[PDB]
Structure 1
Amino acid sequence: DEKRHLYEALLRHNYFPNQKGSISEIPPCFSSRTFTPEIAELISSDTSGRRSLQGYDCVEYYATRYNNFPRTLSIIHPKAYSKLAKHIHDNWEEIRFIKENENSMIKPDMHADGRIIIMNYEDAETKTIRELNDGFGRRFKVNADISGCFTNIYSHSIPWAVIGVNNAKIALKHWSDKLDYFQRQAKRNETHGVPIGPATSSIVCEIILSAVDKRLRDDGFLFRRYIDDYTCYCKTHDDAKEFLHLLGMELSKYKLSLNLHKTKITNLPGTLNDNWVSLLNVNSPTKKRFTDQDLNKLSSSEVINFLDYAVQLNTQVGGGSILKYAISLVINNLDEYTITQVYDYLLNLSWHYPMLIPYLGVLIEHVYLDDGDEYKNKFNEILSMCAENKCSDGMAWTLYFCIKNNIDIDDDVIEKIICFGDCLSLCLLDSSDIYEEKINNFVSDIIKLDYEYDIDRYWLLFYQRFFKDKAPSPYNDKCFDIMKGYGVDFMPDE
């Protein structure tokens, strides 16, 4: 069923930020499964407890981009998220028009693994044919980015996209207003912004932007929207300017604005991908298959020189995730002679760029990690860099590697982890049970601060300690008790 798959996607698969295709932003030890729709129904049915503050804060997870710029993913508190997901499920007949939006490529869709939101799920076949069909006969390409699609989207504009702005103003119940209310409750009862990473906020953004897509489609524009990025194909240059103008009016109707720095008009034919993508693939040592596995095994010189050229392209161009693309090109065609060289190169690049840290888990088995403790020092230096740069993705993945592979962590970097206080990193540290007293001191400071949003920012740590009977429930409601009684575990075993 579409409805049941939507419910299980919202809670069991796309609650945590898990929208990436190949490697996740979060280590795989964190999983939102065993959090079923029945449990969320029981949470939403709970009315006990008193909150001094209005709304709920969320666990914040800082993941670096390719330019080391932090992006704040969020894990919503399960009470507010359960209510929001239940309301989205209950009115899915009125919401599912976002599925039949041909212009939006990244939208809800029934996937095999159980998700609804997967970025870049479509294959290169249909992708290539689609951009060649859209770009045919047109000599201008328009790239326009919404400035604040996650950070300043208007929750009160959720009705305005559904029934119209004027009709929603006269009408002030409808499901869109309740969706607005629950989306506000997801983040501290704040009217602006949505948590990045869950599919509920992606559904809300699709609902808001579907009216803009419909208005642009009714004017005859050929365009594709990936989340907030619009790519339009225009026969003439005034058509590009008119698309930009009409998109500006349609975004300003819902209190949104184009990123004036990011919008650009290029001459077709450009490239189907970015230019660095073709530069990398045309220089890839693994670009041709041989159908025998011994032939397509890369040597040391090939991979080392290709990664050096990738660093050259990242410095010179820097138009995207060049290093991650090249590493994913060469990481699966390695032989056992060259594992140490590529692994040390990945260690250096991962110290410089934390987004390359998860690739260390690809070759984490072949590398003799005991050795002469040099790898322990390198991993702890990576942890120091992650604590200094305040990035949660690299620290979480490195801590996952150290816990799984029994790499020892010094006390000095544990002090830096507590000073940073990333919720997922502290969840991993609590799951190791070595550092119980420091986690206890941290959560005691959070409790004695008596701020409800401070507890909400570490609800996952508090629930992981409560579920293992290491700490009482910080809240006075029954949501944590309901989740513990039905065996909800966000750090499950295999």
Structure 2
Amino acid sequence: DEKRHLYEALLRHNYFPNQKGSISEIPPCFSSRTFTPEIAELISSDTSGRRSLQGYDCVEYYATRYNNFPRTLSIIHPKAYSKLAKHIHDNWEEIRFIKENENSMIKPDMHADGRIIIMNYEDAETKTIRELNDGFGRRFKVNADISGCFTNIYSHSIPWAVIGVNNAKIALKHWSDKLDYFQRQAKRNETHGVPIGPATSSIVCEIILSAVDKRLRDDGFLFRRYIAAYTCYCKTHDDAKEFLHLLGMELSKYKLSLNLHKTKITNLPGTLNDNWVSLLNVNSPTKKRFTDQDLNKLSSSEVINFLDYAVQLNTQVGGGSILKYAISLVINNLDEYTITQVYDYLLNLSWHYPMLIPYLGVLIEHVYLDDGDEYKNKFNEILSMCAENKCSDGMAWTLYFCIKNNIDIDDDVIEKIICFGDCLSLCLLDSSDIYEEKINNFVSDIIKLDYEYDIDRYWLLFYQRFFKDKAPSPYNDKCFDIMKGYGVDFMPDE
């Protein structure tokens, strides 16, 4: 069924931040499968325990963007998440109108892997044909962005999108009001904001933005939405300015607004992709597939020169993720002579740009890591940099490389891994079991605070220790106990 596929997707696949489909933002050690929908029903049914704080906090995760900026992905506390996912499942026949929207490019969809939200998933041919087809006969292309979107979505506006603003205000139960309550329970009983990364917040965002899409559609606008980005194709500048006005009205009705540093009108014909994308692909040494693998295999100077050219292009343009695109272009066709050189270049690029650390997972088997302890000092210097810059995805990926490849990790860099206080980093140090006593000091400092929001901020670490019998639950409810009795592990093996 599609209800069952959504129920699997909300918990087994898209609970953790898993929207990016090329490389994940979270290392593959953390997996949210075995958190089955029946365990979510049992958690929702459980009513024990008393909480002194309204709502639940989230395990935080600062992922690095192309400009090294942090984006705070969140792992919802699972007692607050099981109710939210179960509510979205039970109400799916009244929610699936977001699937029938045609202006939302990334939306819930029955993906084969098990997910429902995968950004940048559709193939290049259809994307090109759509871009030309919608750019047919038009003069201007308007790009608009919602300012926060994740930051300031109003949860009380979830019924406003569903049955209208004034009908919902008069009505103040309906399914969308309980959805608003359950979404609020996900993040500290707070009206504004949604945790970034779970598909439940993507569904909540799609529900609110589908009314905006409906009103923009009914006024005859050619437009597409990519999460919070609206692209409009306009025969004249009348359409260009009036779409911006109507989008501003429709967002302001649901308390949202437009990012005016991201608004720009560009005369068609522009570029189907961004300009740096075609600059890289035109100069890519892999741009032609030769149908024989020896020809497809690249040389040392070819890959290195393309990587230098990508570095200059990112310094000179910087409009997008130039390094990640360029590295994905050359990463899978490396010859054995290249692997050490491109590996060290990736070490250089991963230090300077910590979002490039996941690509280091491709080469680690082919590179002989023992060497003369060069890579040993490299990964620790990266770990120190990720501790310094407060970057969670680079820290977690580097620690996944350190435990998976058994490379030792220094004490002084751990002094800042423990002091940074990223939860997912501390779960990796927790799964190592060598640093049991520095982990114990941190969790004891959390418990001695007697602040439930900090325990909810480190619920993944606390649950991993409780499931590994190294600690008891810090909660008086049965949620951790129902998780552990059924075998829920958020750091599972194969």
Fold match by TM threshold 0.5: yes
How far, CA to CA, are the matches of 2:29 and 2:65 in structure 1? 22
Aligned to 2:251: 251
Q: Deviations over 1:410-443 (max 9, x none)?
A: 1101111000011001000000101000001100
Q: Deviations over 1:173-199 (max 9, x none)?
A: 000100000000000000000000000
Aligned to 1:325: 325
User: Deviation at 1:144?
Assistant: 0.1
Of 210-219 and 331-340, the range deviating more from structure 2: 331-340
User: Deviation at 1:471?
Assistant: 0.2
Q: Deviations over 1:442-475 (max 9, x none)?
A: 0000000100000000000000000000000000
How far, CA to CA, are the matches of 1:154 and 1:21 in structure 2? 28
How far, CA to CA, are the matches of 2:145 and 2:399 in structure 1? 35
Which portions of structure 1, spanning 4 or more consecutive aligned residues, are displaced by more than 4 angstroms? none
**TM-score, reference length from structure 1:** 1.00
User: Deviation at 1:126?
Assistant: 1.0
How far, CA to CA, are the matches of 2:263 and 2:337 in structure 1? 47
Q: Deviations over 1:374-425 (max 9, x none)?
A: 1100000000000000010000000000000011001101111000011001
**TM-score, reference length from structure 2:** 1.00
SS in 1 for 2:295: coil
Q: Deviations over 1:268-308 (max 9, x none)?
A: 00011000000000000011011111111111111111000
Unaligned runs of 5+ in 2: none
User: Deviation at 1:242?
Assistant: 0.1
How far, CA to CA, are the matches of 2:21 and 2:89 in structure 1? 24
User: Deviation at 1:238?
Assistant: 1.2
User: Deviation at 1:337?
Assistant: 0.7
Q: Deviations over 1:314-355 (max 9, x none)?
A: 000001100000000011111111111100000010000010
User: Deviation at 1:120?
Assistant: 1.4
User: Deviation at 1:148?
Assistant: 1.3
How far, CA to CA, are the matches of 2:371 and 2:406 in structure 1? 13
User: Deviation at 1:125?
Assistant: 1.5
How far, CA to CA, are the matches of 1:197 and 1:216 in structure 2? 27
How far, CA to CA, are the matches of 1:271 and 1:429 in structure 2? 46
Q: Deviations over 1:220-248 (max 9, x none)?
A: 00000000000000000111000000000
How far, CA to CA, are the matches of 2:296 and 2:8 in structure 1? 40
How far, CA to CA, are the matches of 2:126 and 2:359 in structure 1? 28
SS in 2 for 1:259: strand
How far, CA to CA, are the matches of 2:489 and 2:21 in structure 1? 24
SS in 1 for 2:341: helix
How far, CA to CA, are the matches of 2:337 and 2:17 in structure 1? 36
User: Deviation at 1:81?
Assistant: 0.4
Instruction: Give the length in aligned residue pairs.
Output: 494
Q: Deviations over 1:80-107 (max 9, x none)?
A: 0000000000000000000001000000
SS in 2 for 1:30: coil
How far, CA to CA, are the matches of 1:154 and 1:331 in structure 2? 42
How far, CA to CA, are the matches of 2:173 and 2:130 in structure 1? 41
Aligned to 1:206: 206
Unaligned runs of 5+ in 1: none
What's the Cα RMSD here?
Answer: 0.4
Aligned to 1:221: 221
Aligned to 2:344: 344
User: Deviation at 1:52?
Assistant: 0.4
User: Deviation at 1:254?
Assistant: 0.2
% same residue: 100
How far, CA to CA, are the matches of 1:287 and 1:434 in structure 2? 47
User: Deviation at 1:22?
Assistant: 1.1
Aligned to 1:65: 65
How far, CA to CA, are the matches of 1:29 and 1:315 in structure 2? 33
How far, CA to CA, are the matches of 1:175 and 1:217 in structure 2? 26
Q: Deviations over 1:102-143 (max 9, x none)?
A: 000000000100000011111111111101100010010000
How far, CA to CA, are the matches of 1:141 and 1:338 in structure 2? 42
How far, CA to CA, are the matches of 2:288 and 2:260 in structure 1? 41
User: Deviation at 1:202?
Assistant: 0.2
SS in 2 for 1:295: helix
Aligned to 2:277: 277
User: Deviation at 1:368?
Assistant: 1.0
Q: Deviations over 1:475-494 (max 9, x none)?
A: 00000000000000000011
User: Deviation at 1:172?
Assistant: 0.6
Q: Deviations over 1:26-79 (max 9, x none)?
A: 000110000000000000001000000000000000000000000000000000
SS in 2 for 1:238: helix
SS in 2 for 1:266: strand
How far, CA to CA, are the matches of 2:148 and 2:86 in structure 1? 26
SS in 1 for 2:332: coil
SS in 1 for 2:296: coil
Aligned to 2:468: 468
SS in 1 for 2:265: strand
